[PDB]
Amino acid sequence: RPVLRSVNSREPSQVIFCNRSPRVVLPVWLNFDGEPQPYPTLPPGTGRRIHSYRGHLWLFRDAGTHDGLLVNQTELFVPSLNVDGQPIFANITLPVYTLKERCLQVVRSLVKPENYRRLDIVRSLYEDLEDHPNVQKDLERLTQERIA
């Protein structure tokens, strides 16, 4: 009964995950209690057929850093019934990050968290670095935005 969850439709829907990003992509399936479950990652520039179901919810993240990704240019992907045997594509891409977010990504990728506050940068940026992407937070955020 959380607002974001898969429905147990038990109706098969063949999907093709297409990783059109330069990241290693973690597909995240929201189970029937809305809890996120990881599925096998996709290397950059690769596609994979998936057996999923109508009304299941998926999101996608950078597997290493959980940076947000988009799927058909939105946050959540929901398989529909296949028309005439054609699978539904889930085209996974980078969003346009803010420059600030992109710089924080690069800095996080280079600097162990214990060493963030050894950087010679303006002090408000330490907490920005520390507040790394988090799927649970995103789910709470997407849930609020939905209500509104």
Partner: peptide, 15 residues
């Protein structure tokens, strides 16, 4: 019964 996604044994393909 609850039916979760799964992945068929198959090669990935290049885009």
């Amino acid at each position: 019964e609850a039916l979760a996604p799964y992945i068929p044994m198959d090669d990935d393909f290049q885009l």
